[PDB]
Amino acid sequence: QAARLRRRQLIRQLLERDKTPLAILFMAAVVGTLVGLAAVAFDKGVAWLQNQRMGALVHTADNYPLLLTVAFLASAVLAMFGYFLVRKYAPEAGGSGIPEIEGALEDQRPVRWWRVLPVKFFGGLGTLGGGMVLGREGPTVQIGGNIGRMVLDIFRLKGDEARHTLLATGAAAGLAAAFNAPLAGILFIIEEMRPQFRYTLISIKAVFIGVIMSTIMYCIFNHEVALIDVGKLSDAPCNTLWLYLILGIIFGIFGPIFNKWVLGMQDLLHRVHGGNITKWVLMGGAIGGLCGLLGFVAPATSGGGFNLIPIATAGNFSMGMLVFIFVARVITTLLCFSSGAPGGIFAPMLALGTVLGTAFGMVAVELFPQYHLEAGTFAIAGMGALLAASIRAPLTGIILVLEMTDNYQLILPMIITGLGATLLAQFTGGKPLYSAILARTLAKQEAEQL
């Protein structure tokens, strides 16, 4: 065996460890600043169109059929504009955009920033400003990875590594700016967006710089109200931690069931239009118009879902209301994401996991009155457990819920629920969702090849 030359190379490699060149480190600060500025202008444009829509529903308050007509039509034309931009100019800007950057980090999936960037921005502004059940982390990760490719072409950085670092720097900075979550942005690249089956040269120090330069832009220019702001919930005694494994087992079964509902609704809604230009846009105006109609009446069934998360965690919702919200937010998420709308499924998975967790917590409170439980500790453990059972990135989602809810006393319930979600997803035969979107787009790409 020739391990004494593998030892000789390793001593050389250990003494050049963590030696990113200065051009990659400087350009990662240029990428992350531009990502953090583009994500602020995206959030300021989405929140402008939402308050322009809600302002148009308090003006015509004396005519309820006209008030429901405006709620349908303002969100229809906003979604029809967003569907048209994807279908005419950049078809890879439809859906999340995270498998488009994951496919780009392993050298498939070309990064057409001259098309995707003024499509995923303005078309995600119409779908998310129209009140559809879509996250801003869909657009901002693909906008971020395309900005990192946009700053690879202006300054002409040569190198295989510098392509993979800066494309991953902006994708990390786009997730970090969407959630105000810097640790979850870096951990999304190490765990999920990494090429999982080979060694890649992505400098994590450059991914750090772009995340932090993006989070500094969240300070100066973004002025909002700290998206998830649940309080300081109760502690979790360590004899009740088996109840968070039951919750993770429940999540780990629904997770694979939810993924084949995402992939099945993509094939089901594609048979409606047949890939046609105007039938896809007219269907997307009906999906977006319904979610603007379901944002005036029953408003906790549409939107991204961060509103209902503090109304959950042992709040206003009864058990019959929690069942109705969960079923309706499954249908509206499946209609929004599995249709080609620019917008992610990652943040609607946060709201679907919170509702399932607090519905489980309401049962665990009534069943076990000796543990002195509240329903809100299970809504925090469940919040990142649909991200663990469907996207299969538990380390990102446990950290992300820690960034957003700020309850470290519930961290061991969170890791127990996030583990049992991943374990039972593997046991019941589910794949990670972004891998399965990518495995379908690359199989469709090779089926169009003659």
Where does this chain bind Cl ion (CB under 5 A)?
95-96, 98-99, 138, 344-346, 437
Residue 250 C-alpha from the chain's centroid: 21
Closer to a copy of itself by CB, 170 or 284: give it: 170
What radius of gyration do the chain's Cα atoms show? Answer: 22
Task: Show contacts with a copy of itself in window 144-173 (CB under 8 A).
Answer: none
Residues near 401 by beta carbon (within 8 Å), at least 6 away in sequence = 350, 380, 383, 384, 414
What ranges in 90-191 are assigned the alpha helix state H? 98-104, 113-129, 137-153, 160-179, 182-191
Shortest separation between residue 442's beta carbon and a copy of itself, angstroms: 5
The least distance separating a copy of itself from the CB of residue 292, rounded to whole angstroms, comes to: 35
For residue 248, what are the CA distances in angstroms to 53, 192, 217, 254, 386?
Answer: 38, 20, 36, 10, 9
Binding-residue pattern over the window 170 to 209 for a copy of itself, x denoting contact by CB under 8 A: ------------xx--xx--xx----xxxx----xx--xx
Do the Cβ atoms of 171 and 189 come closer than 8 Å? Answer: yes
Output 138 or 420, the one with its CB closest to Cl ion. Answer: 138
Q: Which stretch binds a copy of itself (CB under 8 A): 261-269, 287-295, 331-339, 441-449?
A: 441-449
The residue from 46, 300, 362, 398 that contacts a copy of itself (CB under 8 A) is: 398
275 CB-contact burial (10 Å; exposed 0-12 / middle 13-18 / buried 19+): exposed
CB closer to Cl ion out of 46 and 233: 46
Residue 18 partner contact from a copy of itself, Cl ion, none using kind-dependent CB cut-offs of 5 to 8 Å: a copy of itself
* Other Cβ atoms within 10 Å of 302 Cβ, number: 27
Q: Judge contact between 193 and 412, C-beta under 8 A.
A: no
> At residue 134, what are phi and psi to the nearest 5 degrees?
-150, 145
Give the one entry of Cl ion, a copy of itself, none that residue 4 binds, where binding means its C-beta sits below a cut-off of 5 to 8 angstroms depending on kind. a copy of itself
**Residue 439's binding partner out of Cl ion, a copy of itself, none, with CB under 5 to 8 Å set by partner kind:** a copy of itself
As measured in angstroms, the least distance from the Cβ of 400 to Cl ion is 12
Q: Could you tell which of Cl ion, a copy of itself, none binds residue 345, using a CB distance below 5 to 8 A set by kind?
A: Cl ion
Tell which residue, 199, 195, 206, has the closest CA to residue 172. Answer: 206
Q: CA 55 to CA 78: how far, in whole Å? A: 16
Nearest-approach distance from CB 446 to Cl ion, in angstroms:
18
Which of the ranges 51-59, 302-310, 358-366, 412-420 carries the binding residues for a copy of itself, by CB under 8 A? 412-420
Decide if 244 contacts 418 (C-beta within 8 A): no
Q: Give 215 or 377: the residue with its C-beta nearer to a copy of itself.
A: 215
Q: Which residues carry a binding-site annotation for chloride? A: 96, 345-346, 434
- For residue 273, the partner it binds in a copy of itself, Cl ion, none, with Cβ less than 5 to 8 A by kind, is none
The answer to whether 356 touches 324, Cβ cutoff 8 Å, is no
CB 42 within 8 Å of CB 124: yes
**Beta carbon nearer to a copy of itself, 163 or 273:** 163
Question: Residues marked as binding?
Answer: 96, 345-346, 434
Is residue 20 a contact residue for a copy of itself (CB under 8 A)?
Answer: yes
Binding of a copy of itself by 257 (CB under 8 A): no
Q: Around 379, how many Cα atoms within 13 Å sit in the side-chain half-sphere?
A: 33
Contact 186, 207 (CB under 8 A): yes
Residues in CB range of 262: below 8 A, 6 or more apart:
334, 337, 338, 345, 390, 433
Interface with a copy of itself, residue 396, by CB under 8 A: no
Q: Scanning residues 23 to 52, which ones bind a copy of itself (CB under 8 A)?
A: 25
Cβ nearer to a copy of itself, comparing 261 with 317: 261
User: Which residues in 51-110 contact a copy of itself (CB under 8 A)?
Assistant: 106-108
Residue 383 binds which entry of a copy of itself, Cl ion, none, with Cβ cut-offs from 5 to 8 Å by kind? none
Report how many residues bind a copy of itself under the rule CB under 8 A: 71
405 near 73, Cβ under 8 Å? no
- When asked if residue 19 is in the footprint of a copy of itself (CB under 8 A), the reply is yes
